[PDB]
Ligand binder design. Structure first.
Ligand SMILES: Nc1nc2c(ncn2[C@@H]2O[C@H](COP(=O)(O)OP(=O)(O)O)[C@@H](O)[C@H]2O)c(=O)[nH]1
Lengths: 54, 339, 344
């Protein structure tokens, strides 16, 4: 019991004590990463259909 | 008494996590994205059809060369294909046909699979003596193997219906680390871009971030009203998508430690079996029970399109490392390469 | 373009050849999936198929169960002994309380089964005791192994230095397996495939659809479970759970085109138990005479009734004693015929 509780506690501490961020920052970065590679995405950017891969 | 300290300490901890998340909820992904040029609706067509399996295909994994791929079917064979020519580079006779997953190694030397046997079987493609026979069988799991991914020829992580994930040392066959925590079948797992940590989806409707080297669960993501069958990391490694029985797909941010978006549409209440990201992270591809693969805008949350070409459900998905193509496996026994 | 890379094309064709041949062989084989609660007989039926239709067990394969036999033997005596406390039963001879303590001292933790000159006597002394016997009779009031008396009575043969398990011993072993068990066998011209997911301790819902379209399901039911409960919920009667499971598998959308075959197993245990205990512990609305004939029929009618597509699917019930190779032979050989006829 005291042992399991402790085991739980240290895990909750692990989940608890971390460098969180706000959603607007986190979200911006996603838009960022995406908009940054939007052209390199062959499924977004219909690569010159001639004979490339398929 | 002493148990109260711990109990009381436990209670407060959950709330700080609760309140901590709450506090960061200063905006929504949708809000900040509401002002973006929509993906529009892009059309994809089947460029290649891979026939050779008899039974339902349960998984497939693209080789890092974005050309050769493995597919596992319960017809007892792992077929390794030449996505370009459609030639079968291989067909591995499985010691057990109740295969639920297969994994193509980053190096291209090995491949793996396992299932109702609770074993992860490591097949060396380079058997100079000729062809393939099981090189390693990783036993330890007491529930089906739901997913497996090599970090490299030397190590592979596995998820299981026994509620755990595990890291193994192929060379020796010993279970390196057991990732306990989930209280339901772990159905899927995804390796972060660097193979430093990974996330796992489970039947307790929760995802979990695990530190491979620490063998501990960092964070735990909830939000799904049902099992999680598929899981995938956003290309940058700071977010991941989950596919669930509850008819929805969800993006969760690691740094903001919480769900950011939900991808769903009325007139779609069947489960998702697989999720994959487009090379840029813009599109989220989810394989559905209704034979279709739905493509969503990972930022706006709308359906960019839908890949229809399978007669039974889409069981596994896969977008090449170079983002050049998508593979969709199915219970109908065919695989399709979409572009 | 158009060259010697075509060597891959001929190899791919070689593979298709192998796949195709291997594939043809797979459409004319019979696939059977065994289901039912744990302890219902699935494992035994699987093993039977190997004794009847394949090599059966060899001295070597049998000696490899020597450990499991010793473990089951020890596990049984301990469970009965412990059971005396719960139910407050004295030893017939007080000097057994020592052997009881010695039983746990000797019978250490898991390694394998021990079986020593000393443990053998300790056990032989305990089993034989009138008190242990008294409790053993009240084995309906606690979790107890089916093959307990089997192994305990034969302790003189088992505890021998030059012991080798008989196939019966093997058949009686309870080794709990987590990995799906499969046994292939050729019989009556066609090939067979029997699968026992066994204790695939994972939600059934995730792998059930894997067997959609199996030729037939053989659903085992332990008839002797009617007067037993669940050591976790207490109120939950085991026979009732088996029914819920059956209802779930019988009418399961994945098995619509599958032949359901109940194996009302443990009829030999049921026959002796029905004399002592009433069916009314299980089915309180049972007004029938508490005999084998009538009660066994009542139970059969209760499971077959769970079937909702009664107009579309026929439930081929059979009363078995999975540990009796002859009985299983005939019953299976009768299952094989219905199957042949019914479908193929
Ligand atoms: N007397 C008797 N023992 C049986 C019968 N069927 C199985 N057994 C035993 O009851 C126990 C449970 O059987 P098992 O095959 O392990 O059930 P499973 O859990 O479904 O695989 C084992 O000791 C078997 O040998 C039966 O009809 N009669």
């Amino acid at each position: 019991s005291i042992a399991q509780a402790r085991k739980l506690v240290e895990q909750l501490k692990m989940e608890a004590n971390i460098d969180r961020i706000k959603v607007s920052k986190a979200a911006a970065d996603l838009m960022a990463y995406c908009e940054a590679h939007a052209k390199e995405d062959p499924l977004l950017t219909p690569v010159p259909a001639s004979e490339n891969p398929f | 008494s002493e148990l109260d300290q711990l109990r009381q300490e436990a209670e407060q901890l959950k709330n700080q996590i609760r309140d901590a998340r709450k506090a960061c909820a200063d905006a929504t992904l949708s809000q900040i994205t509401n002002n973006i040029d929509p993906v529009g609706r892009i059309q994809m067509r089947t460029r290649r059809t891979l026939r050779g399996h008899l039974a339902k295909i349960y998984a497939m994994h693209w080789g890092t060369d974005s050309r050769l791929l493995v597919s596992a079917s319960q017809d007892g064979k792992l077929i390794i294909w030449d996505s370009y020519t459609t030639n079968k580079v291989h067909a591995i006779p499985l010691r057990s046909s109740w295969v639920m997953t297969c994994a193509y190694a980053p190096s291209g030397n090995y491949v793996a699979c396992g299932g109702l046997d609770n074993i992860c079987s490591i097949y060396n493609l380079k058997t100079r003596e000729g062809n393939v026979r099981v090189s390693r069988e990783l036993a330890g799991h007491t529930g089906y193997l739901s997913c497996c991914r090599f970090l490299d020829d030397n190590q592979i992580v596995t998820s299981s219906g026994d509620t755990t994930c595990a890291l193994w040392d192929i060379e020796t066959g010993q279970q390196t680390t057991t990732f306990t925590g989930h209280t339901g079948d772990v159905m899927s797992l995804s390796l972060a871009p660097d193979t430093r940590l990974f996330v796992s989806g489970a039947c307790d409707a929760s995802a979990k971030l695990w530190d491979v080297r620490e063998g501990m669960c960092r964070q735990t993501f909830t939000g799904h009203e049902s099992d999680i069958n598929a899981i995938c990391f956003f290309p940058n490694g700071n977010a991941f998508a989950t596919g669930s029985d509850d008819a929805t797909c969800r993006l969760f941010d690691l740094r903001a430690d919480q769900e950011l978006m939900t991808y769903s549409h009325d007139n779609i209440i069947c489960g998702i079996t697989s999720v994959s990201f487009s090379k840029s992270g813009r599109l989220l591809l989810a394989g559905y029970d209704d034979f279709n693969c739905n493509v969503w805008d990972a930022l706006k949350a709308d359906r960019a399109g839908v890949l229809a070409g399978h007669d039974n459900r889409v069981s596994c998905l896969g977008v090449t490392d170079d983002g050049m193509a998508v593979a969709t496996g199915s219970w109908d026994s065919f695989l399709k390469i979409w572009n | 373009l158009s060259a010697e890379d075509k060597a891959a094309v001929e190899r791919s064709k070689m593979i298709d050849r192998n796949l195709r041949e291997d594939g043809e062989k797979a459409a004319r084989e019979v696939k059977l999936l065994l289901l039912g609660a744990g302890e219902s007989g699935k494992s035994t039926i699987v093993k039977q198929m190997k004794i009847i239709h394949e090599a059966g067990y060899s001295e070597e394969e049998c000696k490899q169960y020597k450990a499991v036999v010793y473990s089951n033997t020890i596990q049984s005596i301990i469970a009965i002994i412990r059971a005396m406390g719960r139910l407050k039963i004295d030893f017939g001879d007080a000097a057994r309380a020592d052997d009881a303590r010695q039983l746990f001292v000797l019978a250490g933790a898991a390694e394998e089964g021990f079986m020593t000159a000393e443990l053998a006597g300790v056990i032989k002394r305990l089993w034989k005791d009138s008190g242990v016997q008294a409790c053993f009779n009240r084995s309906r009031e606690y979790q107890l192994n089916d093959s307990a008396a089997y192994y305990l009575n034969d302790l003189d043969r088992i505890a021998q230095p030059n012991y080798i398990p008989t196939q019966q011993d093997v058949l009686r072993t309870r080794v709990k397996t987590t990995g799906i068990v499969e046994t292939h066998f050729t019989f009556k011209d066609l090939h067979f495939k029997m699968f026992d997911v066994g204790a695939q301790r994972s939600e059934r819902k995730k792998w059930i659809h894997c067997f959609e379209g199996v030729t037939a399901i053989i659903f085992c039911v332990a008839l002797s479970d009617y007067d037993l409960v669940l050591a976790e919920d207490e109120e939950m009667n085991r026979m009732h759970e088996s029914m819920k499971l059956f209802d779930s598998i019988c009418n399961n959308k994945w098995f619509t085109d599958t032949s359901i075959i109940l194996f009302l197993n443990k009829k030999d245990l049921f026959e002796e138990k029905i004399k002592k205990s009433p069916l009314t512990i299980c089915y309180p609305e049972y007004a029938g005479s508490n005999t084998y004939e009538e009660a066994a029929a009542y139970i059969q009618c209760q499971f077959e009734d769970l079937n909702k597509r009664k107009d579309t699917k026929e439930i081929y019930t059979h009363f078995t004693c999975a540990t009796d190779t002859k009985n299983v032979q005939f019953v299976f050989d009768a299952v094989t015929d219905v199957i042949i006829k019914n479908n193929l």
